[PDB]
Symmetry: C4
Subunit: 332 residues, 4 copies
């Protein structure tokens, strides 16, 4: 019998590693952190100066965040928990502030196609087909329909996935980037409510095995707690990281300042929380107030630059080839 | 020598996984959670609408709980810590409330046979031969005697087991379902008192390897803390889950409301606790008050439906074929 | 290279398991706990009714404890942190209370031989050559000299060891029992002071591999926190367990009652603590007051009997053949 | 696919062990702790009486610490966070106190060469090329230039490294000792800021595999919390240990006494902390006040002597050949 039970070796398919399970190994380097090139592909056509995008959540990204992210060299993805006209108006607002990149989330419901076209009319650069489980005919069809209809002018992101097969299906459907993360978010309760999830280092490694041979970039979405996790996500093969919790405490995020026990916080809630939907798969929580976005991004990029120095990675493409050491429980 | 000591590779027979050690992997899906079929075999003949049964404990299941469980599409198993006439009267009470399924626990003591016949006379549908260790001639004989005597009209459950050999012995004795769980209960101290136990994912996988080829359903009993654990238990191959702690805080469970530190609780105690027996293998504890049973069951089934959506499982039989990823300590 | 570093596979010699790493697996059983035979060899010639002996520590075993242990069916080992005449007087005191077995500790210093002879004159049954590291010529010589001089009338225990080679050396020197435990004691700081130790399940398995083929019993000494650990120690192949912390809180142990924060305690200190020696390898601590020894022993034996029921072990010799499942961090 | 994800077995290059992951196994011994020889090579030419050196940090080592360390039989490495003239004056101060060994840190900036020559003029014995990542042409060139210019009179240490390849490069450049530790320091945030690091037992094992065949000693730098960790570091193959946190609380370290909550502390800060640089990779913290250095060193050496007794190591060279057992999470 299999050592963990039963007679089927495939029943437990893999050992899933998360960010805390690994560290980047130093390697021969003549790269100064200040001189590293942090640019990376968000999609097949769109390259960002900083490999970071903000989550499509209503306590993270509206027009103010999207503008600040683009100015910092990344991009915002506008959330879709609002009327079509209002989302498209936020797209226009971002475009009014110069030649700034912006993305926007759409679902696969019956209002989704109309939402997508209105966003297109407003001048959006990236449409994100925004689901918790992309390995589904309705999601794949939406990605494909969008790519064939507006694909010349707009890049189409599909997600989320956590397996190689799912990433492969999105590639076949025509996705310009594949977003990875089922279960890892800081406000996520999918693991305890549904018992479903996939540790994010292993999910990225698997998704990249399907996407990289087709020249399709992977966006690592969820579970990033520290700037060092961004370096780990990219070294596992992702091309960008999408951040929720790490940006939710910034001045530019939606929501007001909250004072509890003499300390400052902002509300941060899952799009699957009871509040956002009003069976919940997210919580409503708090994150410490962090000040201006520009400063948070500077600290995050700073940690990434340090990782590039330690690993001898002159570019993000080189960082994607770095090696890990796996650590034990004691290592934490 | 064996890496963990000695010269005998069989001394440490297996690596035992519990619920927290695994997550369900998403798979290709065209299943909507609302449309998933949650029905499953409790026994060879009896199929439930919801794959959940309440524990035969005196702080979990008497007539009120049994009626509410059956109305919710599951079933109650009436505890046996009371006189024969009173248990049989609870069976009659459940039957007075319509065509509701009900089960009842019996032991293997010398009063057990008389208890079983009185329950039969009262119209019980399921007899549960209710022990902490079923791999024992007296237990196997009781299962067999019951099956040969009342088996045409009543389904006979045997338990508990934690090994493949034990499950196989119950199958041979004629059990209509095999109940799995030695040591995993939330109020259990068997692990620290006797040093005995078996992590429940591995126990289910092993029991199912003996039971499934004979068409005998497995009931996963104990250690379930979250709705996601129900999905994991079924994916490991169980057909139903038996719940104690998760239902002990409901309005329909026996016992009164307790207020401590401004919060509401109900008493929840092991049938092996000093109180229930009045060498203890259970504690007397508290669980948070949860409100009506119907609402708890709705939340639990909701999480199960989400898991079925993520895994592409249209039925419980399909969910039994889902795959796991094993996670590390950091993953918790 | 070796996965954990370097080029030498023997540098990290084994994976060491402690009690918390394993559980006993249930097995086919027709053993009632009340009818199990708990007798076991303390030494080649001496069989105890209960397989438990009290530690040779000055907060655990003086005459009162030794008498109570023998009456309970086990044995006490009198500590040696006192003058020779006083230790021998405690031996006489135990013998005055009927035909009770008693042991006594000796070191390997230059006063050790005289201590041993005085204990012999006083009628001791067991001499324990009592060291932290028995794999040493001076210790082996002391064991051998004792066995050749007083071996017809007195059984000679040697310890402590944690490796197969060390246990083998004691067997060759003529030990009648081998005591296992380097580093596992509850009050031990050897692991953090010296960085030395050996997880106790693996140490027992290794020692037993050297001792059992020569008919020499193993005493598991240290690290036992629960009655279930006694069952685990014996199933790993030990014949008896030596208890310090679990007995230090009893009425019969030396020392007075201590009240802190409204709760009752007794002092419990390592023989390697600064206080006992007045570079420390033990701490001075507290254990909860537990009441009479007889009651503690009854609870401990109760847990052992339960384990024998679950595993189908009619005797301690059968329990030594039981199997384990290894558990994960989540299992704790 | 690889069990942890992707198709590349080299992506996760190793399983990294830290000090808490292992224990030293006892072995046959006729070594008394008091008689063990604790001397060891700091560099190819310089042997210390005690195998300990103090960190080049401005809350650990200035002239007072360096003098006390040398008197205790070890050595201090003077920090370089001060003007060249002042560092060289501290070297002179140490030399004024007798024939005491002293080292001093230099960087690889454009002021580094002038700093090195001024230290040479002041009579320093050891120059430590002091970086966070030595596998870099500028660092290797500095080591080589120093060795070829002042190598007859001064020993040249290079560091830090965490891989076999990096240690090999320093050996080739002419280093007289290689210092190991990237990420393990108690005040380090490199692991969370950059996601970079290497568990220290594995790092030492790897570095030693490159250095020992060339007769180059390894200094284990960082992560040592207990005296037992010193024994583990040396048994992994290091020849000396460099201590920061363990010495930062001593009377001889720079800084004043701090009283918080009725207890005494001293400030201890990373050289990568915001305070020391005024993207931080260290924190500013506190350590308990420990009293005189001589006493701390005596306790540390005491633990080392105990380890040498347990392992039968008469010399540090013998201790370098000792074996480990790997422990589990439960073992902690
Ligand atoms: O559509 C579903 C699933 C229902 C069950 C069957 C599969 C689909 N939702 C479940 C909850 N999410 S969410 O807001 O919590 C969510 C949104 C973005 C990404 C996430 C990744 N992992 C976990 C949750 C995620 C939104 C809707
Ligand atoms: O009959 C026994 C054993 C005595 C020792 C030898 C084997 C049988 N009992 C032990 C305690 N249990 S219990 O109430 O705690 C209990 C009841 C349902 C299932 C459980 C599963 N695992 C653990 C305990 C369980 C009832 C009686
Ligand atoms: O003789 C020694 C060692 C000194 C270093 C070299 C090897 C021998 N002692 C060390 C401390 N112990 S102790 O009291 O702490 C002690 C006593 C019984 C058993 C124990 C098992 N593991 C750990 C400590 C133990 C007594 C003397
Ligand atoms: O030069 C660098 C790196 C910048 C990023 C690219 C590689 C080099 N520094 C980073 C921080 N350190 S430190 O003070 O924190 C430091 C100093 C001694 C040893 C250490 C070992 N591990 C971690 C930190 C260490 C000083 C400068
Ligand atoms: O309610 C929720 N439950 C689970 N995941 C969510 C929810 N809302 C958003 N997410 C995902 O979690 C990401 C943010 O993760 P974080 O950066 O760890 O906080 C988001 O980009 C989503 O992919
Ligand atoms: O006293 C006890 N000790 C150990 N297990 C018990 C005891 N009483 C009931 N059980 C079992 O634990 C199950 C409930 O587990 P729970 O849902 O985790 O609380 C019950 O259905 C029994 O199988
Ligand atoms: O000071 C000490 N340091 C380490 N081990 C000790 C010391 N004193 C006694 N021991 C051992 O620890 C055993 C008791 O362990 P315990 O039952 O876990 O408390 C004793 O029988 C000794 O073998
Ligand atoms: O700011 C820092 N961040 C990371 N490592 C540092 C820093 N400052 C000094 N170190 C290293 O950590 C060692 C001290 O580690 P410790 O003994 O565990 O406190 C020092 O000798 C340095 O190698």
């Amino acid at each position: 019998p299999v050592p963990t039970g039963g007679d089927d070796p495939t029943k437990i398919a893999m050992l899933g590693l998360t960010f805390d399970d690994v560290l980047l190994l130093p390697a021969a380097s003549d790269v100064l952190p200040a001189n590293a090139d942090t640019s990376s592909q968000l999609t097949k056509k769109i390259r960002l100066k900083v490999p970071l995008v903000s989550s499509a959540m209503d306590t993270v990204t509206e027009a103010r965040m999207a503008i600040a992210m683009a100015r910092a060299g990344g991009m915002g993805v506008l959330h879709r928990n609002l009327p079509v006209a209002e989302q498209a108006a936020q797209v226009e607002t971002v475009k009014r502030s110069g030649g700034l990149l912006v993305g926007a989330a759409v679902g696969v419901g019956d209002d989704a196609w109309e939402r997508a076209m209105a966003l297109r009319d407003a001048g959006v650069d990236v449409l994100v087909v925004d689901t918790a489980h992309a390995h589904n005919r309705k999601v794949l069809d939406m990605v494909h329909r969008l790519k064939t209809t507006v694909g010349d002018e707009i890049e189409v992101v599909g997600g989320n996935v956590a397996t190689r097969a799912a990433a492969a299906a999105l590639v076949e459907a025509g996705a310009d980037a594949v977003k990875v993360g089922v279960g890892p978010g800081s406000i996520c309760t999918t693991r305890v409510v549904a018992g479903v999830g996939a540790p994010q280092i292993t999910a990225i490694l698997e998704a990249v095995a399907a996407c990289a041979p087709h020249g399709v970039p992977v966006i690592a979405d969820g579970g990033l707690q520290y700037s060092g996790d961004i370096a780990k996500a990219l070294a596992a093969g992702a091309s960008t990281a999408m951040l929720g919790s790490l940006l939710a405490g910034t001045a530019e995020s939606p929501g007001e300042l909250i004072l509890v026990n003499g300390k400052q916080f902002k509300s941060y809630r899952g799009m699957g929380s009871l509040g956002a939907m009003q069976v919940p798969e997210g919580i409503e929580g708090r994150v410490p107030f962090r000040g201006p976005l520009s400063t948070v991004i500077h600290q995050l990029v700073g940690g990434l630059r340090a990782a590039m120095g330690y690993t001898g990675s002159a570019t993000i493409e080189e960082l994607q080839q770095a090696q890990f050491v796996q650590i034990t429980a004691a290592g934490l």
